[PDB]
Structure formats: structure tokens, C-alpha cells
Amino acid sequence: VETFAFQAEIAQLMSLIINTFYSNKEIFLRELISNSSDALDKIRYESLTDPSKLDSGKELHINLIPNKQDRTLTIVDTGIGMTKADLINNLGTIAKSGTKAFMEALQAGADISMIGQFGVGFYSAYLVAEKVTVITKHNDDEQYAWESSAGGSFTVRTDTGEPMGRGTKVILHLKEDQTEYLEERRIKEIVKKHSQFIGYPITLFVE
């Protein structure tokens, strides 16, 4: 297991998301589904010129998996996935500029719901989760697990769990008072409200 420090700006963003009083928490789901849709667009585009890029799985979809026993909500996609360099370097490099622009917009009067317009929508997961585990597999790299409970650090390890083929799985270890996001009617409501026109099948699993 390797432990990394978040850049000061991203740690500041995470503390802002965790500490700010903001009731409209449900937008986290739209942000994660939007990320999945973008990663699926990327592999679809690449497969147009190289069909072998789909040897790791032809199906392009998103699954929403609630688990009341584990108190987790998992967002699974079969998108392009992320390499180790994405998890350690590339996400952070992109997030620094996005965070700065988002911070400036917030001071000017914008609200947390607009986070996605700054390319840092993933961190809205901390509105509802105490810990987030991200399992990912890119065609050019091994399967990895990124994890953070915030507090200024994240970990990266090789994942020896069930191999996924290709894509990204975001596991939200929900806060005790945010279990409404495990309810079927609540998730259906949020998907219909914010993610009605996503160009990939969204399957909401039942418990």
C-alpha cells in the first residue's frame, strides 16, 4: 500500500465539501454518472479506430449497486478506466486548476451544485461518503484501488479482488445519516431528475 499527500488545494476543496452546510447533497450521483458517461465516450471513440480496445469487454454501461449490509453505494462503469499515473499524477494536475476556478466561482456567488463545470465533480462524493474506494482497470495497466477518507491523504494499491475487465468502480462508504442513497425509490428519483438523458444503459440493482 502506497500513501500519498493530496496537494494543499485539493485537501482544501475536500475540507470545504465536508464542512460547508449544504442540503442539496443528491447532486453527487449526477457527478459520478457524468464521469462514467465521459469514460464510456472515451473508450467508444478509441474503439472506432482500434476495435481490439473492446477485447476487455464490448458492453458500455453503468450499474448502480446499493448494499445496506455494507452501507455502500457502488457506481460501476465499463469506461476506458485509469492507469496508475492517472491516479497518482494526472487527476491531481487537472484538479489543481479546476479547484482554483471553482473556489473563485464560490466566492462570487456560485454554489456546490456547479462543481462539475470545473472538472472536479468526483469530490462531491464526500457530501455523502466518509470513505471512497475507486477500483479501476485501463487496457494499458493493471487493476488498482485508490482510496481516501480525506484528512489530507489517499492510498493506491494493486487490486487482487475480482478482476473487472475494464472500467471504473466507485464505492461510496456512506456516512451514517446518508443511508437514503441506498433506497431504490430515492436513487430512481435522482437518476430521473439529473441523469435522464445519459447515452448508456443505467441499471439500478435491487437488494
Ligand SMILES: Oc1cc(O)c(-c2ccnn2-c2ccccc2Cl)cc1CCc1ccccn1
Ligand atoms: O468517477 C469516475 C468515473 C470514471 O469512469 C473515471 C474515468 C476513467 C477514465 N477516465 N475517467 C474520467 C471521466 C470523467 C472525468 C474525469 C475522468 Cl479521470 C473517473 C472518475 C473519477 C476519478 C477520480 C478519482 C479520485 C479523485 C479524482 N477523480
